[PDB]
């Protein structure tokens, strides 16, 4: 998978299930173009967002809809979303896992980047 | 001080000094309007961004220019910047501290929301 | 796997490979008895520490040897290790993934707990 | 103040108040000898643990009684406590702040090590 997202709930010690994720790519005119979206599975993972061909060089924004997740669980959280912005593939194709750990007033995010 | 930002460096175990921070407020047309900005001090803190009168309820984005910070230290970073997007709510406590802990491929952020 | 450990390097954006991990279980006399040990693979994962039969109720300490990891990479870090202490299996068997994210002066740790 | 501890709650976005903190120093026989202790204040901070004269180089353990904190708030926690084990080094800066961010199934810790 060239781009995978994994999300964990720090209150429950579980995968964060059914979290909406939107990926954007910065366009030539500096706007954020919709690139891919999906929602995390029962494992907290989102696979299948893109393909090697379509995941070209660029600046990407992964927007994890944390508010919609907490509100569905009946919780009022602090953040609107968690947003990971990075340049991808600029020295050739890489595989990226974007991981996030969610609490109502906090989040942590990291990237695992590998060369196939 | 209704809004403060504090930034640490997890690689050096030190405040993150001279990091640019931009705060935006979401406008009615969903665009991000500049609201306040500054650079973190020797203590990693940015005070004086706004006033009680100016800081009304709404959605704010705090963008921390982490890429330039790491580059100035000679370290290769993953993110373009760190973003913190949140709603200010008058129903809650009245002082917001946005804290961030920076590593080259990760970051953590939390909100400390208190009343004097 | 009843107990798995995963470790990630926040400076490199990679698995943390060849990290030594020692698990202890608190004995009747309140000392920490050696329970299992191993080291993370190329994927940053440590499987095979224990079995369902041998992983009984108790208070466990997972000690991740972060200093030895950083020093092997030629880095002087702050912590001696990262230490995760928790009661396991006290309402019947569970599966535990202990995750850690390492920086030279920081670390983060979370648990994914599932019921088989 | 050569050693300070600050603790936040990631669920409430607030200092972690009245959390017990115990500091130990490693003795020659590898046992942990009590060194200092206290409870975090209304600001989540614990000052006055030691003095420059008492705080010599060595290995220290800071144990934060997170389980009791969460229980007092009616929240089910994973960890027995959070531990931070580190070496004090005179070669480095002279003031240590040990910071921790608490969630029920996770915690993060960092060191802010500075000179006056
Ligand atoms: C170690 C890593 C990167 C991870 C990567 C993959 Br892929 C996984 O499947 C799992 Br479970 C963990 C991780 C992620 C988050 Br979220 C954390 O809060 C912490 Br601490 C560590
Ligand atoms: C920036 C830093 C190190 C911090 C240091 C001091 Br001293 C403070 O008073 C505050 Br308020 C924040 C911090 C600490 C934690 Br615990 C975090 O989860 C994150 Br994110 C950042
Ligand atoms: Na290139
Ligand atoms: Na029981």
Could you please report the per-residue DSSP string of A78-110? SEEEEEEEEEESBTB--EEEEEEEEETTEEEEE
Do the Cβ atoms of C3 and C55 come closer than 8 Å? yes
Tell me the three state secondary structure of residue B80: strand
CA distances from B77 to B3, B12, B104, C66 (A): 27, 14, 5, 22
CA distance B15 to D111: 10
CA distance C48 to C23: 12
**Which ranges of C45-89 would DSSP assign to H, the alpha helix?**
66-72
Q: What is the DSSP letter of A33?
A: E
With beta carbons under 8 A apart, name residues in chain D contacting A105: 9-14
Residue from D13, D110, D111, D113 to probe ligand 2 pocket by mutation (most atoms less than 8 Å from CB):
D110
Per the CB < 8 Å rule, is D114 touching B10? no
Ordered by start, the domain boundaries in chain A are 1-116
Q: What is the resolution of this structure in A?
A: 1.4
Burial track D45-61 (b if 16+ CB lie within 10 A, e otherwise): bbeebbeeeebeeeebb
Distance of CA A87 to the CA centre of its chain: 14
Experimental method: X-ray
CA distances from D25 to B49, D34, D84 (A): 42, 6, 12
Do the Cβ atoms of B94 and B57 come closer than 8 Å? no
CA distance B88 to B108: 20
Residue that is written with structure tokens 């959280």 in the block: A77
Distance in Å, CA D108 to ligand 2 centroid: 10
Exposed (0-12), middle (13-18) or buried (19+): which is D95, by Cβ within 10 Å?
middle
Nearest to C82 by CA among D67, D106, A15: D106
With beta carbons under 8 A apart, name residues in chain D contacting B14: 93, 112-114
Tell me which fold the domain D1-116 belongs to. Immunoglobulin-like (2.60.40)
Between vectors from CA A67 to CA A66 and to CA A70, what angle results, nearest 5°?
85
Residue B48 structure tokens: 């004086």
CA distance D20 to A53: 54
Q: Please state the three-class secondary structure of chain D as a single string.
A: CCEEEEEEECCCCEECCCCEEEEEEECCCCCEEEEEEEECCCCCEECCCCCCCCCCCEEEEEEECHHHHHHHCCCCCCEEEEEEEEEECCCCCCEEEEEEEEECCEEEEEEEEECC
Residue that is written with structure tokens 């000690």 in the block: C63
Going by C-beta distance under 8 Å and a sequence separation of 6 or more, which residues neighbour residue D15? B112, B114, D6, D7, D8, D9, D40, D41, D42, D43, D44, D45
Q: Which ligand is nearest to the CA of A58?
A: 3
Residue C99 structure tokens: 């995750």
- C72 phi-psi bin (left φ>0, alpha ψ -120 to 50, beta other): alpha
Residue A3 structure tokens: 């781009």
**Nearest CB to A108 within list D11, D78, D108:** D108
Q: Which ligand is nearest to the CA of A90?
A: 3
Ligand 1 contact via C68 beta carbon (within 6 Å): no
């Amino acid at each position: 998978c060239p781009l995978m997202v994994k999300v964990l709930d720090a209150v429950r010690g579980s995968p964060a299930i059914n979290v909406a994720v939107h990926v954007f790519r910065k366009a030539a005119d500096d706007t954020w173009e919709p690139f891919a979206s999906g929602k995390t599975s029962e494992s907290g993972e989102l696979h299948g967002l893109t393909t090697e061909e379509e995941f070209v060089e660029g600046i990407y924004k992964v927007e994890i809809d944390t508010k919609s997740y907490w509100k569905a669980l009946g919780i009022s959280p602090f953040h609107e979303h968690a947003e990971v912005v990075f340049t991808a593939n600029d020295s050739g194709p890489r595989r990226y896992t974007i991981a996030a750990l969610l609490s109502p007033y906090s989040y942590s995010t990291t990237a695992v980047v590998t060369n196939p």
